[PDB]
Amino acid sequence: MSEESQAFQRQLTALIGYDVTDVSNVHDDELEFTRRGLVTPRMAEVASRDPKLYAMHPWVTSKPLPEYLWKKIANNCIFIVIHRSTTSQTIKVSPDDTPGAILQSFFTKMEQDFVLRVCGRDEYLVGETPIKNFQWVRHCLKNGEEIHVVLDTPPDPALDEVRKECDRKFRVKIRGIDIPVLPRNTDLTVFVEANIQHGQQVLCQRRTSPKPFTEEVLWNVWLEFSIKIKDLPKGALLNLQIYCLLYYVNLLLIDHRFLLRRGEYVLHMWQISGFNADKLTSATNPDKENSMSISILLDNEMPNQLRKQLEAIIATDPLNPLTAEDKELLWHFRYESLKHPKAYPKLFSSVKWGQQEIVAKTYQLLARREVWDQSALDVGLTMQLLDCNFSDENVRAIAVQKLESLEDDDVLHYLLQLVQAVKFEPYHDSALARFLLKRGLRNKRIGHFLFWFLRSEIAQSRHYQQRFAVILEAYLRGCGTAMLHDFTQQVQVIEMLQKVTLDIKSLSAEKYDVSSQVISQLKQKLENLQNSQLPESFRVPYDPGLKAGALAIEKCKVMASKKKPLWLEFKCADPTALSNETIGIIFKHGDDLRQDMLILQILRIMESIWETESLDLCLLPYGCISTGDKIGMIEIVKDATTIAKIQQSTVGNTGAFKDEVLNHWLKEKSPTEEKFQAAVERFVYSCAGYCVATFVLGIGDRHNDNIMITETGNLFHIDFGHIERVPFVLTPDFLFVMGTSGKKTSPHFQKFQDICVKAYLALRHHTNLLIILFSMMLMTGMPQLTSKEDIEYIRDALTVGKNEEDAKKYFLDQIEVCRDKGWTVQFNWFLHLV
Numbered sequence: 134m135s136e137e138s139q140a141f142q143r144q145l146t147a148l149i150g151y152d153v154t155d156v157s158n159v160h161d162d163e164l165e166f167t168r169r170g171l172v173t174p175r176m177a178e179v180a181s182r183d184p185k186l187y188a189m190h191p192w193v194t195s196k197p198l199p200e201y202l203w204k205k206i207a208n209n210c211i212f213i214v215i216h217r218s219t220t221s222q223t224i225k226v227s228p229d230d231t232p233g234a235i236l237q238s239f240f241t242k243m244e245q246d247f248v249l250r251v252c253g254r255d256e257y258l259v260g261e262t263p264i265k266n267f268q269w270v271r272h273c274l275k276n277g278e279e280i281h282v283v284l285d286t287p288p289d290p291a292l293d294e295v296r297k298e299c300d301r302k303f304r305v306k307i308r309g310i311d312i313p314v315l316p317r318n319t320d321l322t323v324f325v326e327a328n329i330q331h332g333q334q335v336l337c338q339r340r341t342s343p344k345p346f347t348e349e350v351l352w353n354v355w356l357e358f359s360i361k362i363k364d365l366p367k368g369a370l371l372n373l374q375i376y377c378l379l380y381y382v383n384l385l386l387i388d389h390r391f392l393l394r395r396g397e398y399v400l401h402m403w404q405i406s407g408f409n410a411d412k413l414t415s416a417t418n419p420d421k422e423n424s425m426s427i428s429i430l431l432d433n434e435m436p437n438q439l440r441k442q443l444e445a446i447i448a449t450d451p452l453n454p455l456t457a458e459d460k461e462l463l464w465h466f467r468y469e470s471l472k473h474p475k476a477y478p479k480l481f482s483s484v485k486w487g488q489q490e491i492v493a494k495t496y497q498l499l500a501r502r503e504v505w506d507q508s509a510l511d512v513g514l515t516m517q518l519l520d521c522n523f524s525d526e527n528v529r530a531i532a533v534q535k536l537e538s539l540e541d542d543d544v545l546h547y548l549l550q551l552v553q554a555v556k557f558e559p560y561h562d563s564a565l566a567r568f569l570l571k572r573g574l575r576n577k578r579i580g581h582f583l584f585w586f587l588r589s590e591i592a593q594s595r596h597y598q599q600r601f602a603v604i605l606e607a608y609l610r611g612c613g614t615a616m617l618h619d620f621t622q623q624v625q626v627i628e629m630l631q632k633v634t635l636d637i638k639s640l641s642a643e644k645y646d647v648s649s650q651v652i653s654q655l656k657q658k659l660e661n662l663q664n665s666q667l668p669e670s671f672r673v674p675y676d677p678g679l680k681a682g683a684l685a686i687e688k689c690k691v692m693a694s695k696k697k698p699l700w701l702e703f704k705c706a707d708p709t710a711l712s713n714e715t716i717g718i719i720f721k722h723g724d725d726l727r728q729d730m731l732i733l734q735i736l737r738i739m740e741s742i743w744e745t746e747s748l749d750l751c752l753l754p755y756g757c758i759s760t761g762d763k764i765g766m767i768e769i770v771k772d773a774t775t776i777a778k779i780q781q782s783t784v785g786n787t788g789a790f791k792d793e794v795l796n797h798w799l800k801e802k803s804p805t806e807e808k809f810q811a812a813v814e815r816f817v818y819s820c821a822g823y824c825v826a827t828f829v830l831g832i833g834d835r836h837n838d839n840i841m842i843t844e845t846g847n848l849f850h851i852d853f854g855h856i857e858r859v860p861f862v863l864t865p866d867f868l869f870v871m872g873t874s875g876k877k878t879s880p881h882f883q884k885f886q887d888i889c890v891k892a893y894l895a896l897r898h899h900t901n902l903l904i905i906l907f908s909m910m911l912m913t914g915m916p917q918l919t920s921k922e923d924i925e926y927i928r929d930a931l932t933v934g935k936n937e938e939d940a941k942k943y944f945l946d947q948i949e950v951c952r953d954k955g956w957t958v959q960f961n962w963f964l965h966l967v
């Protein structure tokens with residue numbers, strides 16, 4: 134390699150936040166074979182992409198325009214304001230006119246080398262797609278904004294330049310376990326449990342005789358299993374556990390080269406806190422000075438009434454468990470089951486993966502996928518096949534195949550969930566890791582989010598940082614030096630600000646309030662960075678369209694919270710931006726922003742589910758991005774306050790609540806009565822939409838402090854790092870805005886109940902998609918969630934197996950529960966914080 138080729142790898146390590154050219158925490162070469170095996174699909178995608186559309190990354194949608202956005206179109210006319218230097222003129226356009234077709238009409242109504250770019254953003258309107266199919270144009274319609282675009286030169290694709298390049302039973306010898314230290318107080322006991330697993334299913338289990346837990350425990354015991362060597366499926370894990378359950382460690386029995394794992398291994402294990410993705414990891418603990426280590430050794434046509442039972446089994450939810458009777462029925466009528474794509478997760482669960490001949494029969498089954506391949510993509514079904522219950526490479530590949538049909542608009546909606554799904558792959562190089570890699574290198578928008586998602590996990594997950602860092606490096610080596618440049622500027626800014634956030638917290642106390650001495654201390658620290666090595670301009674990580682310029686120090690502050698975060702304001706680095714408004718970012722340390730990311734992503738999916746049934750529930754999924762360990766960025770919502778501060782305005786630090794304050798704050802932050810009516814209108818949909826969503830997600834009972842509202846009536850829920858009770862927040866202040874004064878029906882209450890049940894019914898139509906996203910959220914995002922109890926809440930919330938009116942009743946009852954209590958639960962929320 135070249136001297137400069139090492140400076141490139143050094144840059145990559147600072148970007149990724151982990152050194153992938155590291156061999157200190159491996160007992161094989163799978164990560165090096167994965168860096169090697171990922172050069173091929175990167176090169177093929179870098180080569181197949183059109184440089185022009187790659188540089189301009191048009192954000193497009195093939196979905197139809199909704200009935201609510203059509204009602205905004207007055208006489209089949211859409212106006213675009215085209216700007217140039219100091220002048221501009223409006224253009225009467227048709228929803229089908231492609232960017233080129235309307236550029237030709239601008240040049241006629243009065244050089245042919247300029248493209249259309251949205252003012253202030255790095256967002257372009259290019260390609261053979263109608264204007265109504267550009268997401269920025271749909272955003273302007275929905276929020277009543279005007280379309281502003283500037284006539285300028287298309288970015289040079291030369292900036293996107295990529296740098297050149299046996300029939301015997303299986304047995305295992307347990308030698309012993311060693312730990313450096315353990316306190317001299319409790320004289321405990323210990324044993325080793327070896328499991329052969331595949332898709333969380335335990336094929337076989339052997340334990341050791343229990344010996345006294347000391348700093349070194351030798352057994353020298355051969356543990357013979359019943360499963361023959363040939364019967365071992367690919368992806369089978371040898372899960373070794375220490376119970377007194379304090380420690381665990383996995384080792385793949387079939388390596389990446391299809392070779393059976395043989396020889397001597399001294400594995401550094403993980404410790405338990407106090408089921409989840411972290412438990413399936415092939416990674417070993419990097420902490421060799423403090424961790425426990427086990428040392429092992431390997432020296433090896435159907436009848437009508439049965440059709441009804443089958444069809445009923447196929448018609449159950451993802452969490453309905455399969456009896457042995459059910460699995461035998463599905464396997465025997467294997468070919469009838471194959472005619473129903475909905476039965477695929479259940480049919481592949483019925484397979485006896487520890488039987489070679491039965492796996493071979495399943496592979497024969499998969500070879501007749503005329504029904505599967507010609508079926509409409511069901512993301513819920515496809516995700517169902519990519520969770521912890523599926524470890525077969527070919528079962529997982531039919532699902533990844535179905536994802537290939539997804540447009541970039543939809544890949545963005547499921548990206549964080551698909552990135553977390555890599556945690557369930559037996560091997561580092563997988564069809565899913567390749568699909569993500571390929572889709573990232575193809576769209577800049579997806580590559581940016583892919584970068585931040587992969588980077589959030591590398592920074593706070595030792596269990597999967599090695600794997601994700603190899604996937605990130607493969608992406609980072611194909612995005613091009615324009616993207617590599619932006620990521621560098623973004624990484625520097627977040628690191629400098631993360632140092633300042635952690636320094637400010639230690640200075641004060643989580644027991645006290647912010648002082649003048651802490652705010653002046655922050656201003657002197659920010660002034661030091663600005664005129665020194667703080668990048669001249671960085672791209673907002675949660676809004677890559679925006680380029681934040683220099684800080685606005687005289688408006689930055691330390692928030693009067695308990696996790697003392699930084700409220701930062703930046704100037705816009707685009708002189709073409711239509712407004713002089715700053716870019717506000719909140720920098721916080723002390724909560725898991727990954728849990729907030731996951732909720733906001735479900736909230737965006739729920740918004741698209743309502744978009745299908747022509748429903749706009751006015752949700753405000755704000756920007757939130759996890760940048761490292763318990764730290765990250767959150768969007769500042771302009772002209773917005775909390776429901777608590779509206780209550781403390783009338784009476785401070787209580788307790789005391791009044792029903793009439795929310796409707797008085799709205800009539801105040803309104804210039805005209807027309808704008809005030811629009812606020813009550815926006816509150817009817819945003820309140821209804823948040824009531825529905827928050828209930829379904831089990832995060833319905835929050836303090837009014839974590840619920841904000843904008844000066845334009847837009848109510849929104851915030852801070853999901855958290856999770857007598859209530860289903861959702863419908864306090865008597867919200868109800869007063871809607872014209873109801875407890876046990877009385879007003880026109881806006883009829884409207885709220887109407888949209889509520891219609892939004893609820895609309896979500897119930899995607900029950901399996903919501904169940905599957907939720908169950909995956911709990912395994913890949915929380916400390917630990919029980920695989921049969923914690924999830925069951927969402928089945929009860931979405932009322933599985935009930936008719937469309939008995940469920941309507943259940944939700945209408947939940948409306949009445951929050952009205953009976955009123956402010957009863959809210960008072961307790963203030964006694965709990967004192």
Ligand SMILES: Cc1cc2ncccc2cc1Nc1ncc2c(n1)n([C@@H]1CNC[C@H]1F)c(=O)n2C
Pocket residue numbers: 692719721755767768769770771773774775838839841851852853
């Ligand atoms: C959206 C958003 C979500 C968050 N989730 C978790 C943690 C912090 C968050 C901050 C957010 N952003 C925001 N923009 C503006 C604000 C604001 N919070 N606040 C309250 C102070 N921090 C908490 C806010 F209730 C205001 O008083 N103003 C003027």
